[PDB]
Write a protein that binds this ligand. Structure first.
Ligand code: NI
Length: 341
């Protein structure tokens, strides 16, 4: 049954609540972003209103074949009325088309649902700064101080440099980049741009990336694998067997693979700097796991909340164990006491 943390009080609304069937008393279903754990449930047979970003609307229509009469895309940064309630959608700094939702209840309560996000100081100058927020439904994915990671920019620099050096040393080396959902597109686009290649990929993937409004996209991606020296594969294939296989398929065009796995966090982060990252190598194949995160670090989360000063915090990730809940409530209380709200 739909859990409490996916329900918005004083409304007919739910958030990311498509896998419970008809939810008693839900008049509109909000979808923060196109990741499977959040859209699980949607298909062509859905006949309730769905509210979401334009990009999320492109993917619903094209990938899951939702009928257009049921997709209600909204512009970001704009006050809109849905079943008599004022709402705004804000950039969540997550994957393309990912949003946070502000709800302005009739009674004067204000609710912010972050959906999934990576907190940034740039958010401190959106429409959030203009009024008080009473309740916050918080993406707590990395709510613990062991979770530190580098900026997205330093990680991309590491990857551009690594790849440019490899292929310049050996122009017969192929670069591979794993994917299994939208997001983290900058990894493979920035590598391809420094190497003066297009990124080649399967048709289903090319379809997906065409839904995202990325500027100059036709210039950067292709389904012609042959003309490309940066290839995207499913994450599951990013291993020595999967990569020997793919190298066989390229017909003596290449003699070396350099491959990249964007992971969220890996415990090498507590000890190791981004400068210091090394690959796993077998023969003529090397695999780099790089810490490219689209969720908040513990410090970026703490700073956001301390800035926002919510009256109540409702965690939406890691809720399923008592030891996790308890740990999180401790940190919420720490942050409050430290900042004085
Ligand atoms: Ni997500």
């Amino acid at each position: 049954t739909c859990p409490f943390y996916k329900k918005i009080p004083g409304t007919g609304f739910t958030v990311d609540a498509f896998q419970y069937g008809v939810v008693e008393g839900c008049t509109a279903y909000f979808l923060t972003h196109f990741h499977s754990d959040h859209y699980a449930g949607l298909s062509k047979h859905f006949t309730f209103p769905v509210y979401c970003s334009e990009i999320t609307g492109n993917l619903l229509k094209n990938k899951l074949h939702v009928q257009e009469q049921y997709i209600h895309p909204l512009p970001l940064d704009t006050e809109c009325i849905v079943n008599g309630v004022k709402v705004v959608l804000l950039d969540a700094n997550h994957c393309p088309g990912a949003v946070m939702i502000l709800f302005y209840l009739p009674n004067g309560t204000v609710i912010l649902h972050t959906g999934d996000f990576r907190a940034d100081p740039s958010m401190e100058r959106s429409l959030l700064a203009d009024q008080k927020v009473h309740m916050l439904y918080l993406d707590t994915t990395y709510c613990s101080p062991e979770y530190t990671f580098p900026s997205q920019q330093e990680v991309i620099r590491f990857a551009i440099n690594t790849a440019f050096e490899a292929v310049t040393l050996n122009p017969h080396a192929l670069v591979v980049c794993g994917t299994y959902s939208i997001g983290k597109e900058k990894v493979f686009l920035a590598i391809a741009d420094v190497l003066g290649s297009k990124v080649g990929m399967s048709q289903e993937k090319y379809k997906t990336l065409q839904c995202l409004n990325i500027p100059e996209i036709n210039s950067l991606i292709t389904t012609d694998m042959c003309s490309s020296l940066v290839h995207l594969l499913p994450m599951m294939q990013i291993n020595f067997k999967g990569l020997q296989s793919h190298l066989k398929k390229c017909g003596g065009k290449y003699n070396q693979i350099l491959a990249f796995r964007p992971t969220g966090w890996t415990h090498s982060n507590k000890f190791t700097r981004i400068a210091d990252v090394i690959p796993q190598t077998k023969g003529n194949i090397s695999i780099y796991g790089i810490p490219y995160s689209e969720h908040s670090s513990y410090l970026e989360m703490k700073r956001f909340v301390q800035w926002l000063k919510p009256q109540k915090i409702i965690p939406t990730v890691n809720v399923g164990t008592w030891k996790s809940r308890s740990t999180m409530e401790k940190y919420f209380r720490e942050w409050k006491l430290e900042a004085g709200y």
